[PDB]
Amino acid sequence: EEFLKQIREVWNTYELDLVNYQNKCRLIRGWDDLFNKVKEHINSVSAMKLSPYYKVFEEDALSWEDKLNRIMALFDVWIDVQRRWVYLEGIFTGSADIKHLLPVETQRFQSISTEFLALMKKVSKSPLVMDVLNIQGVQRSLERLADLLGKIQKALGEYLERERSSFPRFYFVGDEDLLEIIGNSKNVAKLQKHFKKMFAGVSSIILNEDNSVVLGISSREGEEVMFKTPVSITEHPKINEWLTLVEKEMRVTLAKL
Amino acid sequence: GFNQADKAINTAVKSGRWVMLKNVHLAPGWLMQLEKKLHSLQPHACFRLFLTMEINPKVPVNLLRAGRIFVFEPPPGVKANMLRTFSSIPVSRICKSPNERARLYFLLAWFHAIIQERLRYAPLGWSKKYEFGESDLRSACDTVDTWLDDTAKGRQNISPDKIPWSALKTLMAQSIYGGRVDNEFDQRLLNTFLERLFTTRSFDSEFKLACKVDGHKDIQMPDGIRREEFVQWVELLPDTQTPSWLGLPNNAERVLLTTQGVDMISKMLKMQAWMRTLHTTASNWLHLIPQTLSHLKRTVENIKDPLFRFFEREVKMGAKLLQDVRQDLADVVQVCEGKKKQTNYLRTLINELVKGILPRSWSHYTVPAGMTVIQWVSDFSERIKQLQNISLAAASGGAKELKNIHVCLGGLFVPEAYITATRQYVAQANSWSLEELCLEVNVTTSQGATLDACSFGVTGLKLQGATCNNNKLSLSNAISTALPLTQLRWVKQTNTEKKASVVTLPVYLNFTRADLIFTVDFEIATKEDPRSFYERGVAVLCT
Amino acid sequence: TLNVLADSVLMEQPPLRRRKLEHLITELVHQRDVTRSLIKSKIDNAKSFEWLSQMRFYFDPKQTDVLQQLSIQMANAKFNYGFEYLGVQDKLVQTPLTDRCYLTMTQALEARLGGSPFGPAGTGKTESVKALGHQLGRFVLVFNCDETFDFQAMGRIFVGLCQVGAWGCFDEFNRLEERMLSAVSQQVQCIQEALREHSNPNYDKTSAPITCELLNKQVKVSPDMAIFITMNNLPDNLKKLFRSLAMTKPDRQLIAQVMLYSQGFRTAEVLANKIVPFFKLCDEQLSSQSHYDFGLRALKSVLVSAGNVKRERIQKIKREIAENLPEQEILIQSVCETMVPKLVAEDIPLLFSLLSDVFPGVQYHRGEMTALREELKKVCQEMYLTYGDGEEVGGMWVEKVLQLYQITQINHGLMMVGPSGSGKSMAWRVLLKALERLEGVEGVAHIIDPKAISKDHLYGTLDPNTREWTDGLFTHVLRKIIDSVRGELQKRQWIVFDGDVDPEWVENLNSVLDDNKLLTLPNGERLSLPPNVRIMFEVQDLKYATLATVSRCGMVWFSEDVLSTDMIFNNFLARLRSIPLDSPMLQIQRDAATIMQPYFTSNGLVTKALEHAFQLEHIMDLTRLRCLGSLFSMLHQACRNVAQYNANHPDFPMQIEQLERYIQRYLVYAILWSLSGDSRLKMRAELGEYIRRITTVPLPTAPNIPIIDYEVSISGEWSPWQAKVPQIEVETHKVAAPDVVVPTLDTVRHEALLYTWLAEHKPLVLCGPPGSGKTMTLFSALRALPDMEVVGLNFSSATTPELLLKTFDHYCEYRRTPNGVVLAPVQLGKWLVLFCDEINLPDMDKYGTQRVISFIRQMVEHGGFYRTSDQTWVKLERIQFVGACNPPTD
Amino acid sequence: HLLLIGVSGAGKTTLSRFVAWMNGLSVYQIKVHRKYTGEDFDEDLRTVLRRSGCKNEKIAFIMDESNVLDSGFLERMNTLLANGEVPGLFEGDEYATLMTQCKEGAQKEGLMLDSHEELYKWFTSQVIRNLHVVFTMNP
Amino acid sequence: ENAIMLKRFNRYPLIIDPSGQATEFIMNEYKDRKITRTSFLDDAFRKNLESALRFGNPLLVQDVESYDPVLN
Numbered sequence A: 001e002e003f004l005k006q007i008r009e010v011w012n013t014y015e016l017d018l019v020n021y022q023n024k025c026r027l028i029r030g031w032d033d034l035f036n037k038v039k040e041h042i043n044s045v046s047a048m049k050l051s052p053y054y055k056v057f058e059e060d061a062l063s064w065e066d067k068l069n070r071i072m073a074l075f076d077v078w079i080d081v082q083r084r085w086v087y088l089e090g091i092f093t094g095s096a097d098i099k100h101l102l103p104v105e106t107q108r109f110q111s112i113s114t115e116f117l118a119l120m121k122k123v124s125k126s127p128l129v130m131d132v133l134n135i136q137g138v139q140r141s142l143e144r145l146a147d148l149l150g151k152i153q154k155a156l157g158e159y160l161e162r163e164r165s166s167f168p169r170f171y172f173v174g175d176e177d178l179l180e181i182i183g184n185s186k187n188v189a190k191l192q193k194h195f196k197k198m199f200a201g202v203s204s205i206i207l208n209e210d211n212s213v214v215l216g217i218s219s220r221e222g223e224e225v226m227f228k229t230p231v232s233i234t235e236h237p238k239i240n241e242w243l244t245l246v247e248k249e250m251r252v253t254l255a256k257l
Numbered sequence B: 001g002f003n004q005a006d007k008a009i010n011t012a013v014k015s016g017r018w019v020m021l022k023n024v025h026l027a028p029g030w031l032m033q034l035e036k037k038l039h040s041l042q043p044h045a046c047f048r049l050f051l052t053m054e055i056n057p058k059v060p061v062n063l064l065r066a067g068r069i070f071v072f073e074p075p076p077g078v079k080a081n082m083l084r085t086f087s088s089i090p091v092s093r094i095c096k097s098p099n100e101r102a103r104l105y106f107l108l109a110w111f112h113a114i115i116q117e118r119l120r121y122a123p124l125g126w127s128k129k130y131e132f133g134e135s136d137l138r139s140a141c142d143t144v145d146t147w148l149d150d151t152a153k154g155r156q157n158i159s160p161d162k163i164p165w166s167a168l169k170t171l172m173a174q175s176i177y178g179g180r181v182d183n184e185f186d187q188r189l190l191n192t193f194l195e196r197l198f199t200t201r202s203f204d205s206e207f208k209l210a211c212k213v214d215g216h217k218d219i220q221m222p223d224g225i226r227r228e229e230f231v232q233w234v235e236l237l238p239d240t241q242t243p244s245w246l247g248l249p250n251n252a253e254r255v256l257l258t259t260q261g262v263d264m265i266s267k268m269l270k271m272q273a274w275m276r277t278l279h280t281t282a283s284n285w286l287h288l289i290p291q292t293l294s295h296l297k298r299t300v301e302n303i304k305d306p307l308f309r310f311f312e313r314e315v316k317m318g319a320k321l322l323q324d325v326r327q328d329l330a331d332v333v334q335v336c337e338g339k340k341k342q343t344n345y346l347r348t349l350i351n352e353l354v355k356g357i358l359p360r361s362w363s364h365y366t367v368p369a370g371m372t373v374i375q376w377v378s379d380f381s382e383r384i385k386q387l388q389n390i391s392l393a394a395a396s397g398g399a400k401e402l403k404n405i406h407v408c409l410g411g412l413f414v415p416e417a418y419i420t421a422t423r424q425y426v427a428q429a430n431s432w433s434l435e436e437l438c439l440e441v442n443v444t445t446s447q448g449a450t451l452d453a454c455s456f457g458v459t460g461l462k463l464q465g466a467t468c469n470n471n472k473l474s475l476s477n478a479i480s481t482a483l484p485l486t487q488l489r490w491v492k493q494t495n496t497e498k499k500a501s502v503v504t505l506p507v508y509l510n511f512t513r514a515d516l517i518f519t520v521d522f523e524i525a526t527k528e529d530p531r532s533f534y535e536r537g538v539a540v541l542c543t
Numbered sequence C: 001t002l003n004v005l006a007d008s009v010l011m012e013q014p015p016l017r018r019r020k021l022e023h024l025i026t027e028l029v030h031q032r033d034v035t036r037s038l039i040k041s042k043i044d045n046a047k048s049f050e051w052l053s054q055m056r057f058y059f060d061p062k063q064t065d066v067l068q069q070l071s072i073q074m075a076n077a078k079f080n081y082g083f084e085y086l087g088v089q090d091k092l093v094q095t096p097l098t099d100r101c102y103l104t105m106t107q108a109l110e111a112r113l114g115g116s117p118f119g120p121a122g123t124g125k126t127e128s129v130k131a132l133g134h135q136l137g138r139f140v141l142v143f144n145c146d147e148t149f150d151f152q153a154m155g156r157i158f159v160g161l162c163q164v165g166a167w168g169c170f171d172e173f174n175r176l177e178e179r180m181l182s183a184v185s186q187q188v189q190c191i192q193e194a195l196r197e198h199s200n201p202n203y204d205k206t207s208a209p210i211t212c213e214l215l216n217k218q219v220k221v222s223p224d225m226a227i228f229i230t231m232n233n234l235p236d237n238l239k240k241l242f243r244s245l246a247m248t249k250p251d252r253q254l255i256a257q258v259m260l261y262s263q264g265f266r267t268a269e270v271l272a273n274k275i276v277p278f279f280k281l282c283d284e285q286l287s288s289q290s291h292y293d294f295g296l297r298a299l300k301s302v303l304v305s306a307g308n309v310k311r312e313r314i315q316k317i318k319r320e321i322a323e324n325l326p327e328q329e330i331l332i333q334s335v336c337e338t339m340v341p342k343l344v345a346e347d348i349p350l351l352f353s354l355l356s357d358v359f360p361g362v363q364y365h366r367g368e369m370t371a372l373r374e375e376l377k378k379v380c381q382e383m384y385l386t387y388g389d390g391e392e393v394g395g396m397w398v399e400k401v402l403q404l405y406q407i408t409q410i411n412h413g414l415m416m417v418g419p420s421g422s423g424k425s426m427a428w429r430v431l432l433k434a435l436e437r438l439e440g441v442e443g444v445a446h447i448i449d450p451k452a453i454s455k456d457h458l459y460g461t462l463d464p465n466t467r468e469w470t471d472g473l474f475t476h477v478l479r480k481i482i483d484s485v486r487g488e489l490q491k492r493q494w495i496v497f498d499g500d501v502d503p504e505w506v507e508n509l510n511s512v513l514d515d516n517k518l519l520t521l522p523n524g525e526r527l528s529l530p531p532n533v534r535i536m537f538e539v540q541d542l543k544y545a546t547l548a549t550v551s552r553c554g555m556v557w558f559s560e561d562v563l564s565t566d567m568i569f570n571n572f573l574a575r576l577r578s579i580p581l582d583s584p585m586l587q588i589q590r591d592a593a594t595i596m597q598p599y600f601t602s603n604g605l606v607t608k609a610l611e612h613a614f615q616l617e618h619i620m621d622l623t624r625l626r627c628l629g630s631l632f633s634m635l636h637q638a639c640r641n642v643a644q645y646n647a648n649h650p651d652f653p654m655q656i657e658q659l660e661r662y663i664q665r666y667l668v669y670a671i672l673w674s675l676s677g678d679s680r681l682k683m684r685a686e687l688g689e690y691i692r693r694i695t696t697v698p699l700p701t702a703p704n705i706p707i708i709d710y711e712v713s714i715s716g717e718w719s720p721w722q723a724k725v726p727q728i729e730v731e732t733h734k735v736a737a738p739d740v741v742v743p744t745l746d747t748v749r750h751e752a753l754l755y756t757w758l759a760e761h762k763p764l765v766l767c768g769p770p771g772s773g774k775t776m777t778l779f780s781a782l783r784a785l786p787d788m789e790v791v792g793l794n795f796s797s798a799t800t801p802e803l804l805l806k807t808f809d810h811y812c813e814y815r816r817t818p819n820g821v822v823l824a825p826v827q828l829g830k831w832l833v834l835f836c837d838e839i840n841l842p843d844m845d846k847y848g849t850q851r852v853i854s855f856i857r858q859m860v861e862h863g864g865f866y867r868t869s870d871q872t873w874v875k876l877e878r879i880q881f882v883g884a885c886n887p888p889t890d
Numbered sequence D: 001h002l003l004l005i006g007v008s009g010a011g012k013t014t015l016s017r018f019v020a021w022m023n024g025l026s027v028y029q030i031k032v033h034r035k036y037t038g039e040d041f042d043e044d045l046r047t048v049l050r051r052s053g054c055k056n057e058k059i060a061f062i063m064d065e066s067n068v069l070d071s072g073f074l075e076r077m078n079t080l081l082a083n084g085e086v087p088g089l090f091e092g093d094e095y096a097t098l099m100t101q102c103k104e105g106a107q108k109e110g111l112m113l114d115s116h117e118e119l120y121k122w123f124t125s126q127v128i129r130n131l132h133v134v135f136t137m138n139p
Numbered sequence E: 001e002n003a004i005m006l007k008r009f010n011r012y013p014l015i016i017d018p019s020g021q022a023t024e025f026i027m028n029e030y031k032d033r034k035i036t037r038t039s040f041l042d043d044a045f046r047k048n049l050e051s052a053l054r055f056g057n058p059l060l061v062q063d064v065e066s067y068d069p070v071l072n
Ligand SMILES: Nc1ncnc2c1ncn2[C@@H]1O[C@H](COP(=O)(O)OP(=O)(O)OP(=O)(O)O)[C@@H](O)[C@H]1O
Pocket: C384, C385, C386, C387, C394, C397, C419, C420, C421, C422, C423, C424, C425, C426, C427, C540, C563, C567, C568, C571, C572
């Protein structure tokens, strides 16, 4: 009886902690503690079902079990719906060139993020666990968002694989490195850091005043090779084509030298 | 292949057919899963599963226990090996291009057989057990094919002197066969074989594949042009194959037998109430092993002597190992009588000792592979006796008497350090540099002959395969010809080319040619040739 | 051409032109060796294998395709130059072993097999593969297997190698874990089977693209790719697909000769024939140490340093042809300058004896460095330390300081190693002050204890959900230096990592110590090391440090013989004569020091007593500095007692003779209670007997009661402790109470020692068998004092610094009003004594250190600690430590 | 506090429980499993100290060598047996509950609660008077 | 004799068999009572053991080297 009273008090006085995220919303902090409490209560209720005095409290325990399961059935999804979103956030706002490369998935992510922000605003107005669970169709929208995030993540991975296939040297750099490369294609300053991972000795690119034509390459030790025919990024804006042109012109310049 | 084999075994156990899985040693985990799956009842009784594989420790023990093992080994002999090589090579490859190709293949086959049959006599004949498997033979055949195609554009018979002999020799010495050869002295043997076989003289009727076989018989080169003649000559080889077919001394077979016999005893010893006999053995070892030797070293004066420091290190290491062994054997004695508790470490040593395997905690120096414990403790006792003589000589006179000591290299833990210390001392005297000193070896008859300046005395050196008379080497049938007293003299290098009547013999540490200490330049008799010394595995041994 | 190049390398050249010059010299030397012998031995045919074996280059500019312009042929193998830009790479001397490696590898590649150059580590197998790849102009990737391994990256790496057509070499395949080895072997087997099918005799004209199954997808395999598996056997999958090669013995003599010839030395052959056997001797004759490195890489670095030294000498002579230089002297000078700083005190005479054996009659003159020597002397004089040149007292320590300065110039990421008690911290502190006064650049040192805090607090943490990065100690310090809002640049910043080193907290530092100088934070930001920042590792044993960290750091070894006992005595006497314990106090201190000076001599009472006490048996490992610090604290308390007696008698204060008697007897009393003061009664009696034998000072005349039972009264006479023990009558209900303590001889003696060692805020530990009455006596004495607030902390087997932080938060407060944050007890005028009983209980981690013990050591030696909340240095005020524990043998 | 050394099954636990039942003391048994951890042992120690110090109930602490898994349990119990109380067990809200129940026990017995330090001293005295531990182990 | 000991026991048996003959025998003897297989390494073992004490179901626990003190 007092065990059920403890469960009732704990789950009627439990509040979901919220921490600000880049002044955009408040994400749930403390997943580990909440999941530990949920697992402990579920296991304790399962053993309470096994207790001999249980038939007196049976029905009540059953109800709580259902509630507990529902809580579980929510939050295991929720953290996922958070994590991927945060990941996607770090891809879809730190860069400005992702929109042009991935427009359909950009629109889908904007639509997903609108609903996600609305759900977070609704949660912040009532951070109680019972109040959060009782909002209309939280699990339905949460699972829809989870499936959408999975699909868009698969699409982003497929686009990354396509970018690697177009320029095979991208296979050396990491997935996060490739995301930074494609997202920050316009500003070449972020590309020069990874340029020592693809080529054997090339460590930087000597560009023009406006960073529009790749005048040549530069090694780590300061040695510079000037292209016989400079390649232009304005004429070939996509990363793969102008990088392939850079590599081919490097080979040609080395041959002429 | 995993899914294919699973489907095949399913349909074969349903219908009642047979399934073979070849080279299953590459999938140990799959083998375990197959053992688990097969443990269930098999509906059909006519179904048979065969697992052809190589003998590797990666196979699961459960699968070995659950089935019938069949061990297959290739038949020994040069004739069998060459027959296998000729059967493996397709007839189309041999009978193609200039006819000389066929003869070349025969030579290659013969060569392969030689360098494979010498592998059985592992210590004397190949030093180590190299692989020299089928892949090397295929690579050599590909090299021969490519180079013969390059040199002879047309199918017409190319002159024997126009064959790229240098190309084949160098590619099968530096690459392919010599790729796995590490030490220089096996490379010398391989180069000797290649220069003897792969030469333009092989296409003449008087060529001798092997000379002095069984004293006077010689394996004459067959006079054939096609593959059929060579394979018929192979099939006509006599059964009486002595090791002289490989260039090895006839006694090598005897030596091998001896080792095998010892192995049998060890295996019997490894597969044998124990407290009384363990107690008496341990007590006898305590009586045998010297009690204790003390570090009498670390004098501030005369520390500049290299022999001083080297003998300090030797004494310290020997004393440490001596104390460890003595204390552990005393513990074993106590536990045999039940006068002390038994711990995990003591369990390890007692289990190792009852079966005849030396304790890993006891092996602090270089040890011949699979040396039985009694041999180990006898060798250790001899080492401590030598170290005690060293300490007594140091105490009596100082570091000056340390020079005039006939120290045996085998007894020392690190003989290479002794050679280095000798070099440093001979440099310090007369104020020379180490680069300008070269070692000259003089085998003197007197075990205690006079040591003149640079000369240092060494005992226990055993020459295998040859006898040294008046510093001149001569080939002999008897093995392990002991050297009376070796004088190592570090003399200033005169920067001259060694005459063709000298041989650079290695000085290995023990009968297993695994550790090389140094090399000795020995003059040979005028009758012999250095190639015979190289190919018969003549070497000096510290023990 | 070789003569022209050798003339050119002797002058002053730009570093890029110097690298080009030495590459040209190396290749021209190889060409000279090839043509002089390998082609001039009666060779007249262009098709002879004596010429086909050598790597021939054929140039056809008429070819339109760039990849078909240049053809590189060795034996029957023909390759197309990939024209990949390599920059300025290190060139390998073409030794005969390297020639055979090239031949075997090209033969394996032509047959579409792989290469497995097995051999002992350090023979150049990976470097040989890389040099062969760079010779053909192919991108070469080296995958080290020393736990820096990842399938998720190497699957796509293999896909990229198959696609672009680059080379892939594994550093040591056997270093791989069994499952890792098997899976990567499966991938390598698939790739190599595709490569073999690329050369099918019936399908030589490859129409359908030859592809492999990588990442569960079809990947085209470029014909120019190759996989090399460097070993030290091969898995059964790859035995029939890889050709092996024995790279066992590199030709060190030829490498050294060619490199010395490229450096400009005109006697390269003799110098190499001397320097290779010398390095072999140093590897053999010298002792075995973790940080010793006499391999081929160290030899190459020594040779390039010798070339730099010779060029510097040439420039010095020119500004004051020139071929009369003592090349051997330069070579041994470089060898010494590179090896002596990391040599233990035992191996220095051994190294010099080896140098004399190999280089006979050629001696070493160390740099004068007089400009730095003057500032070092001034700083040492103003820091109460001892300075001396060469054979003088302090010569070894100042030479260690100079070596530290040299390694400071040479590279960043220093490591000062040595047994505890050597002059390590003082050395670099004095060097920093001397550099500040000499060069005029202010020196700032950040002393960070790594084991005190967690790795997350040390480097920073990324929020699991918010993905917000908050920087740690080292990250905050480096960021503050880089930003330099106050102007951290233009100042010598030294991040000293005082403490122990383990392979855990140095993982992120490995990318900073090496040439990258690049800290890669988990969030993505990359911090660049400024040229004015040096990362110092002040460690003790260097026992749990990986070879990667040690090899990346220049090292100075501080043996205990560096800091002699005379130096300690001189420092103590100077501080006593200058620093006031509280002018009359300074006068008393000067008189006391004048009185005790004769005993603190080279062979005085204290040195002999220390030597004898080292022979005795102690419950804890006797250290010279613990012993000497206890003795010095006791002498300071003696001076304090003299001052108190003078205060109590304003008229007729302590006279010279009474002070002499009191100090002379108190010296023996403090020696007895500090030397062997942590040993049993028998050892104390033995040390007292030895002191009585060797000393001349009057001693207790009673032959029955040991000297340890006496004490020195303020009048200057030996009085028994039993006279100071009162007879206490305790209430009936207080019999055997948990808190009551009955005064006795041991109680009063330990109380006197406690007060003596707590007057100087020195933490102390009561060791003894269970039930001996350590906790009760310590608590009673601590609570007896009226201005002392005692807090009892029981150290369990899971004690962490978090317990100390919780105690500080509960009892103390942070005040920002002083220069920095100050942690002080809430109660005013109360000294907080943290009685940590069972002090030795906390467990050691996997690398032999206790985090809480290191924490207390940091807060005692330095006087403060870094708060992980804002990475600021808080300074302890009115906080004191006291401990008690059972013997470590329990 | 008593330590009982002897072979298992000799009746140490049974005899100790028999004497505790005769003398009126309650018996507290730590229920250990595979998932037992240091915090659970700390909670058990807190409960037994609360029942022995705040309330005059006398408790016979039944412990066996099996119930001790790591050295932390042993060190906590060494502190409890020697000093009479464990300083670090009560923190925050637990300390406040301790003080409240100590004031309640003082007013039940007829003592003035005074300050926190005097209440803690009274609690320690009650624990050393109203708590006995028997440790059973094999030789 | 071992089967006799298994049939007539006062303290719960501890089966020590290198093979699985005894284990399979004790299953085949107790199928009608629905003998349940568990192990001390299993995380749900306690739960299963709890059920074993409720419906009177025999329970088998393997790997007694890592004995669970909760069974005391
Ligand atoms: N000339 C001197 N140079 C250095 N230390 C000196 C000198 N003269 C006296 N000393 C004393 O020697 C000691 C040197 O301690 P130092 O701080 O150098 O050691 P550390 O290696 O940093 O310490 P730890 O043992 O904790 O690793 C100090 O007590 C110092 O006062």
